[PDB]
Design a protein around this ligand. Structure first.
Ligand SMILES: [Zn+2]
Ligand SMILES: [Zn+2]
Ligand SMILES: [Zn+2]
Ligand SMILES: [Zn+2]
Ligand SMILES: [Zn+2]
Ligand SMILES: [Zn+2]
Ligand SMILES: [Zn+2]
Ligand SMILES: [Zn+2]
Ligand SMILES: [Zn+2]
Ligand SMILES: [Zn+2]
Ligand SMILES: [Zn+2]
Ligand SMILES: [Zn+2]
Ligand SMILES: [Zn+2]
Ligand SMILES: [Zn+2]
Length: 256
């Protein structure tokens, strides 16, 4: 029952899934309608909350490689420092399987996940077309963002699992960093056949009100797929299975 403090929110759902003794978890899991329920009764910390982490007495601390309080956590407990960029969503769960020694439980999760989504992918393409493209549009702080195949927002399900085709210019732009800000008037340039927009529940965003948005072919064909932003930030086994179910139905229904 080794006590883990998960400061980096990327790896919270993957450890919970494997049954880790998470005694502390990043506050930001509360934004996910999948993960909030999984972590009720678990202490919420934010960045800088070293004593909040310390007080729950962790045997292990998990932080990002860009976390500034690493030396502070090193004084509290053994700190596993994780470079996000180093592993993709499946390899990332393999790593968490090592942390808790459930490496064989992950190999079975991976196999079933890959089987189901590949088979899902053949089905999705049957409705929308083999080379039908999907775009990612995400607003935060009134800025517009798009992503590669491994930066949340459904990308790892859409492009890796399902094998759907990524919008040609979105792929070029995000090939470098995995993410990129989009000029609200170059939005037509990155729009694809289908659009995943993280504006579910959100008041009609600035980019969903422009006349260029109303004139996109995806909008015209009713191919806008709206999803909750906070829920779609993640790429954990809990989130993955939800997005799998959610994206499949919303895309197929969009296909008339
Ligand atoms: Zn806090
Ligand atoms: Zn202990
Ligand atoms: Zn951190
Ligand atoms: Zn790693
Ligand atoms: Zn790196
Ligand atoms: Zn592997
Ligand atoms: Zn192992
Ligand atoms: Zn089926
Ligand atoms: Zn083709
Ligand atoms: Zn906003
Ligand atoms: Zn601001
Ligand atoms: Zn890819
Ligand atoms: Zn079309
Ligand atoms: Zn939703």
């Amino acid at each position: 029952p080794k006590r883990i403090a998960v400061v980096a929110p990327t790896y919270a759902g993957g450890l919970k899934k494997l049954g880790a003794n998470i005694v502390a978890v990043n506050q930001q899991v509360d934004q996910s309608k999948v993960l909030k329920d999984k972590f009720k009764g678990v202490t919420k910390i934010g960045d800088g909350d070293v004593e909040k982490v310390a007080k729950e007495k962790p045997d292990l601390i998990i932080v990002y490689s860009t976390d500034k309080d690493i030396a502070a956590y090193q004084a509290v407990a053994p700190t596993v420092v994780v470079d996000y960029n180093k592993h993709k969503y499946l390899e990332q769960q393999e790593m968490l399987g090592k942390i808790v020694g459930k490496e064989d439980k992950v190999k079975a999760w991976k196999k079933d996940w890959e089987e189901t989504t590949a088979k899902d992918g053949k089905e999705i393409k049957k409705a929308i077309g083999q080379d039908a493209t999907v775009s990612l549009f995400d607003e935060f702080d009134k800025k517009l963002y798009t992503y590669g195949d491994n930066w949340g927002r459904g990308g790892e399900v859409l492009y890796q699992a399902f094998g759907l085709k990524m919008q040609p210019e979105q792929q070029k732009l995000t090939a470098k960093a995995g993410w990129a800000e989009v000029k609200q008037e170059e939005i037509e340039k990155y729009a694809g056949d289908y659009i995943v927009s993280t504006s579910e529940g959100k008041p009609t965003p600035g980019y969903e009100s422009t006349n260029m948005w109303k004139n996109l072919k995806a909008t015209k064909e009713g191919h806008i797929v709206k999803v909750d932003a906070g829920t779609y930030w993640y790429n954990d086994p809990y989130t993955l299975d939800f997005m799998r179910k959610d994206l499949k139905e919303k895309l197929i229904k969009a296909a008339k």
